[PDB]
Each structure stands twice: as structure tokens, then as C-alpha cells.
Design an enzyme around this catalytic site. Sequence first.
Site, short mmCIF file in Angstrom:
data_model
loop_
_atom_site.label_atom_id
_atom_site.label_comp_id
_atom_site.label_asym_id
_atom_site.label_seq_id
_atom_site.Cartn_x
_atom_site.Cartn_y
_atom_site.Cartn_z
N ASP A 144 17.58 33.05 66.56
CA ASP A 144 18.57 32.01 66.82
C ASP A 144 19.11 32.12 68.24
O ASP A 144 19.66 33.14 68.63
CB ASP A 144 19.69 32.19 65.79
N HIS B 230 17.43 28.77 64.58
CA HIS B 230 18.70 28.23 64.11
C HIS B 230 18.50 27.15 63.06
O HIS B 230 19.40 26.91 62.24
CB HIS B 230 19.44 27.60 65.30
N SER C 273 25.93 26.90 60.73
CA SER C 273 26.41 26.86 62.12
C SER C 273 27.93 26.73 62.12
O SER C 273 28.61 27.56 61.51
CB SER C 273 25.63 25.82 62.91
#
Length: 258
Positions: free
Chosen positions: A176, A208, A130
Site C-alpha cells: 500500500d 491499497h 482507508s
Amino acid sequence: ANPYERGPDPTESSIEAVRGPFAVAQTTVSRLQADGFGGGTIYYPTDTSQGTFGAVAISPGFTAGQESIAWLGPRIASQGFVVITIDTITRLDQPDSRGRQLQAALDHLRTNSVVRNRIDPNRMAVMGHSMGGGGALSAAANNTSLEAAIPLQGWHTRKNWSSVRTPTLVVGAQLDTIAPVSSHSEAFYNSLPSDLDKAYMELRGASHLVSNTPDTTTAKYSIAWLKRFVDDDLRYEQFLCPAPDDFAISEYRSTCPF
Ligand code: NA
């Protein structure tokens, strides 16, 4: 001969293994000991007889701790790498800051009494999840000597990575909703230079959170990428080129052959 090759000749099974051929140990870097990052855990091969190893730093994402990416540490290190999983200076740090902290964590290793004599400080790589994956891209864009970069469901406001000169594997998650591939991962792959050694792999059906618990597809291709580019290990190109025949991958693109 390539002096950086480590371990026996690989197979699909060898790169899928939860632990590779190197036994590993770990040591903690406290926040106080860490200059330019929030501390971390270093995972390293205990065998000193096969040479020094390349080094890898891994960052978590926004509001996340090292615990969210810890499983990658020993799984990668056991393939023959010294791997530091970091905490950031604050939980709110943004991607560019995370990139500088990834570089600081790498640079810390040469001063760490436990592992300094186990590393080749000239062969380093960055990874992250991320915003930590955005950090990995920023670290590569700020250090053309880095050997590899691997953003995992990377998040960044910067979409143009045309100045990156480091071989980069972009790992997206198909479902995601936090760092959607269309506006993050795929945009990053598309703006990396067309003549860079690079690949995009989208994980079928993945959220995610795929990088925050063990995922064999993530591990096997991260290992192959690090071998191919941190160690220049040509034995691992077969796993990266051409698209794997692998149902866990919903999309693949690359600049193969490398
Ligand atoms: Na390299």
C-alpha cells in the site's frame, strides 16, 4: 450455551465461501431517510427463525462511494449479520466524521421497518476502507460499547489508539502506497492497548485497492473476527489464533488467546 451463535459449526471452507449459510435480501436507505450519514444499502438474513443478529456498518474511503465496498455487504451478511454499507454525507469527509456516520448508520437500523426486528442493537461493529477504516477506529474510540472494529487499509492522522476498548482486527496491504502499513495500519495496531483482544494481518502482495474487489483473505478473517466478537462465538477463535498458516498473509501479530 452461547445464545448468539448462528449457523453450523465452521470450517476454513465455510468462512471462505462467497455466500454463507444464510440467504440474504437487501433494502435501500435513501440519503433523505438517513440521519447523520449519506444513505446506504442494508443486507440482511431473510430467515427469522434463528434469532436476531448483530449489526455491522461499513464505510468507504475518501472520494469513494458505497460501491467501492459493496461486495462485503452480502458476503458478511450471509454469515448471519445485518450489514449496512454507507455513503458519506460528502465525498470529502475526513476520518473522525466518517466514524460518527458509521455510528449513525448503526443507530439507524433500529428505526428501519425492514430490519429493526432482525437485529440485536446491543451487538454492533464497525468496518471501513482507508479513511473509512480510520472512521471505524474513531467510532470505537467514541463508543466503548461497540463489539468489534475492522479497519481495512485504514488511513488516519491520529496514530495513538490507546483509548480503544473494542476488539480490533487491523488489516494492512503489504504494497500500500496510499495508507502505508508502517505509518498507518501498524502504528494503529501498536498503539491499541496491549491487553486488548486485537490482531494485525498484512495481506501479501496487496495494493491499497485490495478491499475494493472481492478478496477471500479479507472476507474470511473479517467474518471470523465478527463472529468471535459480535457473537462471542468461540467456534471461530481457531481461525484467528495463532497466526494462520496462509500464504496470502505476509505478517501477523495478535494478543491470542482471546
Ligand atoms: Na462481544
